[PDB]
Amino acid sequence: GLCALRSELQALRREGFSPEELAALESELQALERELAALRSELQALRG
């Protein structure tokens, strides 16, 4: 799940994977987090 992928990247960073090696994966995860946050705020806006 989103949570597990977040914990997997922390693990990879703990195991010595560098930012250049993970930049594309970390930036994709960040965007999905932010898109999920957006969807939830759209729902609150409808309910509002």
Add this chain to the structure above:
Amino acid sequence: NLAALRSELQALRREGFSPERLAALESRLQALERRLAALRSRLQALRG
């Protein structure tokens, strides 16, 4: 919890809220889920 989000979307639809905004959000949720599983796969290839 994307299942929860889907449940909220369907609840709002039953309650008469903007069917078109809800459709647009459902569409974005599908696209987000496609990228989520694709990211999951890329991480699995690295095998920690």
